[PDB]
Amino acid sequence: NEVALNCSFDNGKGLPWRVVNELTSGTAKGTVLFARPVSLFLNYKPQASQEAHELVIGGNWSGVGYPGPYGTVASDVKGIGYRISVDAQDGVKRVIPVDNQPHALDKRVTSFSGSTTSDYLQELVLTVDPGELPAGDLKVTSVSGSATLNLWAVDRLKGEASIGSVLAVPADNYPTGVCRKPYSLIGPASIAIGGGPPPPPIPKKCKVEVGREINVKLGSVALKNFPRVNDTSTERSFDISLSECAALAKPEIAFRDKYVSAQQADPTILSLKSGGAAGFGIVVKNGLDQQRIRFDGTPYPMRRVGDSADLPLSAAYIRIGAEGELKAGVADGAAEFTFTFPSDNKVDGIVNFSGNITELE
């Protein structure tokens, strides 16, 4: 129970962040995504005293007037909040509060050894619904704003200051060098306290096998089956799917005509490879929105089911020519599709349509 002088806080062995809970569309507000246990060395020089002394460890957040959802201070990443608490010797978890004054969260019996530890729990909390979360990785590097984390090691007469109360910091400087000044952490430093790695990012992508080909057989149809322009063959159903998707992945898919580069007068009509049938095209219908796909590069959202994302599709021949224009033959078309997470620029696959326009039934 000696007097503490010249306090300083120093980093211990730094732990990696751990996943308390998995982020999911099902994750509730207030859930703890990540947590880390931090241990700091508290060093001071003892000097003998007649009266018993205590080292009172205090904390408070300054630079913001009031706390955020779930006792958090806003993180640089929106919808994710930072909360830090001390694992007190009395066996109580106490969160450092947002207040103008520091609060007494722990005490340490003073000793000549001049060495002790301060123990904390770091927590990253979801303050919004997962859908509400921003696009991108979501890595947390810093607290938002000017908010600063203050740790106070303060020497006091044993038992004079109550735990859980505002921590009074004496006006006096004796004995010269008494422990009174704060340790203030700003921005990434508050997040990076105690050393160790930065929080991990959240994955937002599905697994894409590049060069994937899909073949759809439209079959053979006689010209007599398309009496009027805008008439179509029987629909063929197919699905374009992605698997091993991250919980919060929301990918999109875009299509281009393999044979046409310029913007089409009507991009709902996919072109046939030339030297075959004439006056016909292919139409593909989006199962979700119920509208025909445009093959100009418009991106389409995909449905999410379990770990996979898919777009349900159906395809058919459509008659575009007037009476003179129709010709029979091989009817083949191709659509290149790209996925954006958004993270794709290269073509990621092709859909091949094959079939025939025949004269005789």
Numbering used by the authors: 3 to 363
From the article:
The crystals belong to C2 space group and the asymmetric unit consists of eight molecules composed from two up-down-up-down tetramers. The molecular mass of CupB6dscB1 in solution was determined to be 39.5 kDa, which is consistent with a monomer. The pilin domain conforms to the classical Ig-like fold of other chaperone-usher pilin domains with a C-terminal β strand (strand G), provided by the NTE of CupB1 located at the C-terminus. Five alternating residues comprising glycine or large hydrophobic residues from the self-complementing G strand (G351, V353, F355, G357 and I359) are positioned to interact with the five pockets of the subunit groove. The adhesin domain of CupB6 is 205 amino acid residues in length and is significantly larger than typical adhesion domains of the chaperone-usher family, which are usually between 150 and 180 residues. One unique feature in the CupB6 structure is a surface-exposed polyproline helix (199PPPPPIP205) at the C-terminus of the adhesion domain. Adjacent to this is a shorter sequence (17LPWR19) that also adopts PPII helical secondary structure despite containing only one central proline. Adjacent to the PPII helix in CupB6 is a shallow pocket delineated by hydrophobic residues V21, L25, F36 and I204, which further suggests a role in receptor binding.
One of these clusters, encoded by the cupB operon, is unique as it contains a non-chaperone-usher gene product, CupB5, which is related to the TpsA-like substrates of two-partner secretion (TPS) systems. The CupB4 chaperone was shown to be associated with the tip adhesin CupB6, which is larger than classical adhesive tip subunits and displays only limited sequence identity with other CU subunits. In this paper we describe the crystal structure of the tip adhesin CupB6.
